[PDB]
Amino acid sequence: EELTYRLFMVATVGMLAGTVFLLASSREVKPEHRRGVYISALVCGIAWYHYQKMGASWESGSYDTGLRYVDWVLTVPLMFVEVLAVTRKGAAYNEAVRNWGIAATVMIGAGYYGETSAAGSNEYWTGFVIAMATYVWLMRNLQAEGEGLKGDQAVAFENIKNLILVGWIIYPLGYIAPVVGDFDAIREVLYTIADIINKVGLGVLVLQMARVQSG
Amino acid sequence: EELTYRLFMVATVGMLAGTVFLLASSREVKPEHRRGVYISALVCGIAWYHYQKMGASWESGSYDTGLRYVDWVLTVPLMFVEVLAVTRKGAAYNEAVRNWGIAATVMIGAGYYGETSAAGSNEYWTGFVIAMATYVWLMRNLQAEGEGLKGDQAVAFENIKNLILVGWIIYPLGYIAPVVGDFDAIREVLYTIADIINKVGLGVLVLQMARVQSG
Ligand SMILES: *C/C=C(C)/C=C/C=C(C)/C=C/C1=C(C)CCCC1(C)C
Ligand SMILES: *C/C=C(C)/C=C/C=C(C)/C=C/C1=C(C)CCCC1(C)C
């Protein structure tokens, strides 16, 4: 139980560092590519706040699984937005933002729907199935987003895509874990680590893409 | 105590109502003038969320006074943004957003600094002066913003400006109340009512300006 607490504080500090790093480095890219960088720092700042609330809620003996999903419902759509903001602009950006944003919201909501039921129950499987399908629909969209890119942009986008494809697998895995057995304490540890890597990492890589686009 | 709880619940409903009204209504204006409407819906959505937490917190017995400031620090800057979204575009917008945003953030921060100390204390008066100066600077900026507007836009903007000018006076007044005397229960009530009116109201008027700009 102490490790779980300690990791919430480590994440708190990492998310803040990520936020301030990204805000500081935003001045280093051309204004027309800063949007993604700004949304990235926002994601990290939201996560910074929620990890503080998670950490307080854990050492007080009241730990709300709820606070995790509140974070995800905000940050997951925004993480798609970070990415779309460096791959698109104009009407096409506003369209993907709406369409992918809604899909990411539905994924997390289906998740929460299933999570708040008995594991193995019908609600649980329904949640999994609908979120998993939306997850797949999003990963496919993200894979399609790279087609047409050239040179250093293609390489920069390849890194953002692969961070999400590989890095986000742990979330559905964790959801499934407990029907396979007793993986409850470990899931909380792994998700925290994952969140730090996925949110600071993606910000960094969005910042790298924006620099490429600025040279 | 009971009225305060009651009002929290009413606010929660009112903020949600406002959010859905503004999102539904966003299709009725041209894409180029929707931004301010979208931010106004966001503003209402954030307050919806915080008022649910404020309600639940109030029922605890031990009510967290910081929740209010968490909402303000997010929403107050966004309200200035939703205003600048209908009075500005391009570079000017982005600059005003940064600077008025910072200013608004500082105002609420000073407030919080002073609110988290003894009433009458040194810390208290410092928070007040800094927040008030910043408030004054903002209102003076808001006033200047209408210059050059003609006809129906000048009228629509007069309404935005007067909602903020008149509607936000209650906040610093409530801050000073405690040093006159015992006003803790009533302040909560008045801030709640004010928030509904200022947040939903401003959204409606930004929508109305967007409609005017839409022809
Ligand atoms: C910063 C946080 C991130 C990127 C969180 C991502 C979470 C997911 C991709 C969750 C996915 C889920 C499914 C695909 C199925 C099971 C239900 C969820 C919500 C755990
Ligand atoms: C939706 C919430 C709104 C529009 C809240 C507005 C809050 C203020 C304008 C607060 C202002 C303050 C000062 C001018 C001085 C005393 C400290 C504050 C923060 C209460």
Residue A29 and residue A18: Cα distance in Å, rounded? 17
Q: Which residue, judged by its Cα, is nearest atom 17 of ligand 2? A: B111
Record the resolution, in angstroms.
2.0
Alpha carbon distance, N-terminus to C-terminus of chain A: 48
Q: How far is A47 from chain B (nearest CA, A)?
A: 15
Chain B residues whose C-beta is within 8 A of a chain A C-beta are 31, 94
CB atoms within 10 A of CB A70: 17
Say which experimental method was used.
Answer: X-ray
The 3-class secondary structure across chain A, one letter per residue, is CHHHHHHHHHHHHHHHHHHHHHHHHHCCCCHHHCHHHHHHHHHHHHHHHHHHHHHHHHHCCCCCHHHHHHHHHHHHHHHHHHHHHHHCCHHHHHHHHHHHHHHHHHHHHHHHHHHCCCCCCHHHHHHHHHHHHHHHHHHHHHHHHCCCCCHHHHHHHHHHHHHHHHHCCHHHHHHHHHHHCCCCHHHHHHHHHHHHHHHHHHHHHHHHHHHHHHC
Q: Provide, as residue numbers in chain B, all residues whose Cβ is less than 8 Å from the Cβ of A31.
A: 94
Enumerate the domain spans of chain A: 1-215
> From ligand 2's centre to the CA of A108, what distance in Å?
34
